Amino acid sequence: TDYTKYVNTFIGAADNGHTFPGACRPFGMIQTSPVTGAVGWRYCSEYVNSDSIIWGFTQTHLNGTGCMDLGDVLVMPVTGTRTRAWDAYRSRFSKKLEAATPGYYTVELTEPNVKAELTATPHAALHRYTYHNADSASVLIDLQHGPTWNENQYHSQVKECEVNWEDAQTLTGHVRNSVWVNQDYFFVMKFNRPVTDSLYLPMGETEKGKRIIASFDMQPGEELLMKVALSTTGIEGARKNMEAEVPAWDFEGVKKTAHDDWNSYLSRIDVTGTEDEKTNFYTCFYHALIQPNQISDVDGLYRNAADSVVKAGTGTFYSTFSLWDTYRAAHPFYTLMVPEKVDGFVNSLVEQSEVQGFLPIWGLWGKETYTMVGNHGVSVIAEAYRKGFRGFDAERAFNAIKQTQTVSHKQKSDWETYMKYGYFPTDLIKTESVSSSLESVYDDYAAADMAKRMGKTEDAAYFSKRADFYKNLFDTETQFMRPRNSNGTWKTPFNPSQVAHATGGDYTEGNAWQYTWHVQHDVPGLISLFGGEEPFLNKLDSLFTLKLETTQADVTGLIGQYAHGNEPSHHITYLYALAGRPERTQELVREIFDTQYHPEPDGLCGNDDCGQMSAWYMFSAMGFYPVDPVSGNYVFGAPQMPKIVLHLADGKTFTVIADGISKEHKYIDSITLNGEPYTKNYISHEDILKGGTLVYKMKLEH
Ligand SMILES: [Ca+2]
Ligand SMILES: [K+]
Ligand SMILES: [K+]
Ligand SMILES: [K+]
Ligand code: NA
Ligand code: NA
Ligand code: NA
Ligand code: NA
Ligand code: NA
Ligand code: NA
Ligand code: NA
Ligand code: NA
Ligand code: NA
Ligand code: NA
Ligand code: NA
Ligand code: NA
Ligand code: NA
C-alpha cells in the first residue's frame, strides 16, 4: 500500500498550523517549498493556503514553529523584463493546479507562465521549471530573502554574502544571517543549461545579500533543471553533498527515492479507519518525521555552536530540537517507531552541550535560541537511557545533564536563586517564574532517574530532593500553582486566568489554570496536595468549563481554560483516568479528535510545534499517552480508530483494536492484552515492544 497518498502536506498551511507544503526527506536538511504572501507583511510562516501570490521557493523550513524559520536561498522563474524592483518578480497561481505528495510539490506560476516542480534529497533541492513562455527565460536567485516579522528586519538580515560563478552552469556562495539564529550556510547551485547572461540587481543600502538574474536560451515548452545543495561547513562540503545525492539530473529518480523513503517510515503503522481518519493520522506521522533536521555533510562534518567545523561522533549531526514541546510525546514516539534515530539525537544533544556548557534548550542550525523554558533535553536523554538505548556514552550524557541542572546558564536557569528558595521567586525573576520552576522540576526528576539507573547514589539523592520542589508553589488556599515571593508570601493580586507572554507574567504561553497540573512525574503527589481524588477532580471539572467573557478573543483550541495548542495542557485530559475517572478522559480525547484535527489546510487548532501536536494525536489515537515520558508508561485514554497496527523494529507487531468504536460508543468497557484481562491504568514500553494485541471493548454506557 502507498501510505503517502494519505499525507496532505497542505494541512496546517494556515495561521494556526505553520506547516509547509513543499518537498523534503524525513529528518532532512532540505525543505524546498513556496513562499507566499498577501497584502502587507505577515509576521510568521512562509506559506499559507489562503494566499494567492508566490514570491519564490526557499530550501529550508521549520514545521509548525511560532515564528522562527530558516527560509534560505529564494529562487523564482522569471520571463520577460529582467531588471525590476526586488518585489516585482512575484506571481499569482491557481489552487487547482497546485499539488503535493511527500517528496514533491508542483504549481503553475501565472505571471512568468512557468510550471514549477520541486523534489529533494537530504542535502539538495532539485527543481524542474517548464517555460510555457521562454522569452528571456531567467531565474531570480535572491540571497537577501529570509523569514522576518517585519520589513526593516528583512532588508538588514544578511550580515555577509559572497558568490562566485565557477562556470556557465555553476554558482557557489556563502551567506551569514542573524534573525532568529546566527546562521552560516554555503551552497553549490547548478543548472542543466548554460547561463547566457547574468545580472546583479542593485541592493538597498542595508542589504548585504545579492539578487541575481540568470538567463537561458530556451524555446516554449522547454525545461530547465536547477539543483542546489547546502552545507554548514563550506562550498566543498556542499559540493560533496550534491555529488552523493544528485550527481546528474534524474528528477523522476529523486522524486521516487523520496517517495520510497517516506513510505519506509509511514508503512510502520497500518491504520484502519475512514479516509479522513487515515489522512489525519498519516499527515501527523509525516509532520513528526520532518525534524530533527540533519545539518551535517555526508562525511559527518558540521559547523558547531563555537563556529568550528568538527566531525559528528556518529557520522550524523542533528538540530531543530524544539524540546519544550517535543519531550512530551514526539520524543517518546521516536523511541517506539523511529528507534534507529534516538541514539543519533542523544549524541547531537551531548556534543552541543560539550561546546556551549548545557544541553540544547531549543537547538537550531547547531546553535542555541533559548526559546521557551526548562532544559528538556534532560528528559529526552534520561528517557532514552531508561528505555535501553546504549548507542551513546552514558557518562558523557549524564555529565551533560548534571552540568545543565547545576551550572547556571541563559536565559532562565539561575540555579543559585533556584536552590536558595526552592523555586524561582516572582519578585526576583521578572517572567515565567512558575513555569520555569515546575518545568525545571521535571528535568530534576529525569536527572534523578538516570542517576539511579547508573548507580550514582549521591547524585540521585540530590536530584530527588529537587524533584519535590513543585510542592513549594502550590497554594492550598486557592488550589493553584501560584507565583511566590522571595519573602515566602504568595503573589497578590493573583489572576489564575491571566495569560502570560514573557506583556510578561509568571507562566509560559498560558496561565495558572494550565500550569497547576504540570507535575507529570508525581501525579499522586499532586492529588495529595489537593487533599485527594475528590477535590482534584472537582478542580479539573472547573478547568474544562471556565470561559472568559471580557478577554481571550480567539478560543481556538480551548475547552474552558484547557488549551489544546499549549503543550503544558497536553497531559491534562489523562489526569481524570489517573484520579479514578477514566470515562472523562475517554470523553475529552474524543472531543479533541472531533474538533481540533481535521484533514484540511485550516484544519488544525494550533501550530504543529515540530511534530508535538502530531505525536499527541498519534498516541491518543492508539488509546495511550506518555504523561510521564521518562517513566516509559503510557496512560490509557481511549483509542480513536477501529484498528492500528505497529510494526516494531525487530519484526514484532503490536495490534490495537477498538472493538465496537462508533460515534456514541466511545467509552471503554474492558481491556485485554494478549487475550487476558488487563486492569492497570497504563501499559509499559516493554509490554508494547514484546508485541501482541491490545483490545479495547468499546461501549455507550457511562
Ligand atoms: Ca504551542
Ligand atoms: K514574514
Ligand atoms: K535564514
Ligand atoms: K490543489
Ligand atoms: Na505582493
Ligand atoms: Na498552480
Ligand atoms: Na526564448
Ligand atoms: Na538566520
Ligand atoms: Na530563453
Ligand atoms: Na553542514
Ligand atoms: Na522525553
Ligand atoms: Na508527556
Ligand atoms: Na526520542
Ligand atoms: Na543537536
Ligand atoms: Na541544535
Ligand atoms: Na527520549
Ligand atoms: Na504531555
Residue numbers in the entry: 30 to 86, 86A, 86B, 87 to 529, 532 to 731
Please quote the authors directly.
Here we used a functional analysis approach, coupled to detailed biochemistry and structural biology, to reveal a pathway for the degradation of plant N-glycans encoded by the human gut microbiota. We describe the biochemical characterization of five CAZymes and two crystal structures to provide a degradation pathway for plant complex N-glycans encoded by the human gut microbiome. B035DRAFT_03340GH92 is then able to remove the α1,3-mannose, followed by B035DRAFT_00995GH3 to cleave the plant-specific β1,2-xylose, and B035DRAFT_02132GH29 to release the core α1,3-fucose, leaving a Manα1,6Manβ1,4GlcNacβ1,4GlcNac tetrasaccharide.
To investigate the structural basis for the unusual specificity displayed by B035DRAFT_03340GH92 we determined the crystal structure of the enzyme to 1.43 Å. The GH92 consists of two domains: an N-terminal β-sandwich domain composed of 16 antiparallel β-strands domain and an (α/α)6-barrel catalytic domain. These two domains are pinned together by two α-helices, previously dubbed helix 1 and 2. The active site of B035DRAFT_03340GH92 is comprised of residues originating from both the N- and C-terminal domains, which is a common feature of the other GH92 structures. The +1 mannose is likely recognized by the side chains of at least three residues: H530, S533, and E532, which are positioned underneath the mannose. Overhanging this subsite (and possibly the +2 GlcNAc position also) are three hydrophobic residues Y72, W178, and W209, which is suggestive of π-stacking of the sugars. The +1 subsite interactions allows space either side of the +1 mannose for the +1″ mannose and +1′ xylose. There are clear pockets for these sugars in the B035DRAFT_03340GH92 structure. The lack of activity seen for BT3991GH92 is likely due to the plant-specific β1,2-xylose on the core mannose causing steric hindrance within the active site, whereas B035DRAFT_03340GH92 is able to accommodate this decoration.
